[PDB]
Write a protein that binds this ligand. Structure first.
Ligand SMILES: CCOC(=O)c1cc2ccc(O)cc2oc1=O
Ligand SMILES: CCOC(=O)c1cc2ccc(O)cc2oc1=O
Ligand SMILES: CCOC(=O)c1cc2ccc(O)cc2oc1=O
Lengths: 118, 114, 118
């Protein structure tokens, strides 16, 4: 899985261990091994949510499967929780785009995750 | 709705009021309330369009519904117009990816829109 | 087509000619004219792959058509090869999300690539 967070919160406000915490928590939530989880945090961004520049975050979570109604609600509770406690961003100022990726559309290690057909 | 603009134009060339103009015009164009519109502008990027480093922009607009043939042509005229007037980027050096999001695939406020 | 590379490798490590090499090689691989290929390289990013901060890259390739099983494996071999040779990133620390875009969902030049029906 791949999780990206873009926020106007300053870099100094990102706590040590944050990328590791996201990796570990996402591994647990998705059931995927941590070795396969990638995380990218982008602070100091020029952005607004509802016309306001108060702290906010625009994010995305891509995963091959493990994406759906109930799971996404659960992912959001988890992620909004972490953004609120770690970056002090209010949950109602957080957007998370979820993408259910097809294995053939995810490249890795010189190939893709579609290794069964030619 | 969520709108992102990545450009090689320098930050100093982004005019005061740009994020607000984007927010209000997108609210108008999509019919969505402005308090739910999010905008992200990323200047000073290392990018090329057609192999050239002249000003350009790579964007995306995500919306739950309100995405389609005519509407997207409408959004593109509006957005290219703004990028041309405000950031001096030629419309033919602008790409905008449109995404019609399913409500269950958009997280917000500890839950999703489903 | 549009190709984005986000990486924790420093800017200084991006070699002169990289954006042009990506443009030319992607034109070749997708069969699309180079004039329509857009590339964006984002170095010095705060990111982790598998919990580690060793060099890695999270990428995306968007194209109207020319996206599929065999083609994506070919794009991955090409792109991981370039990232390994030019940015010294291990192919197993690279993820590339492929997006087959519908022409009506790609804006350009005040309109979209859907010019047939209105
Ligand atoms: C085999 C499927 O499981 C995995 O490890 C995955 C890797 C992965 C990489 C990139 C990505 O954008 C989305 C992803 O989702 C996954 O489930
Ligand atoms: C007002 C109802 O719809 C909304 O609020 C929306 C929010 C939203 C968030 C994130 C996103 O990627 C795309 C979105 O599109 C919308 O229509
Ligand atoms: C005319 C030949 O093809 C094109 O123009 C294309 C442009 C394009 C723009 C943005 C994008 O995200 C993906 C794209 O894929 C294409 O094939």
């Amino acid at each position: 899985p791949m999780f990206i967070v873009n926020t106007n919160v300053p870099r100094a406000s990102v706590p040590d261990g944050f990328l590791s915490e996201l990796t570990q928590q996402l591994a647990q939530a998705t059931g995927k091994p941590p070795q396969y989880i990638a995380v990218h945090v982008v602070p100091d961004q020029l952005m607004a949510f509802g016309g306001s520049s108060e702290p906010c975050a625009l994010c995305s979570l891509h995963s091959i499967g493990k994406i759906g109604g109930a799971q996404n609600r659960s992912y959001s509770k988890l992620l909004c929780g972490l953004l609120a406690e770690r970056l002090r961003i209010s949950p109602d100022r957080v957007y998370i785009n979820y993408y259910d990726m097809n294995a053939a559309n995810v490249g890795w290690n010189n190939s893709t995750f579609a290794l069964e057909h030619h």
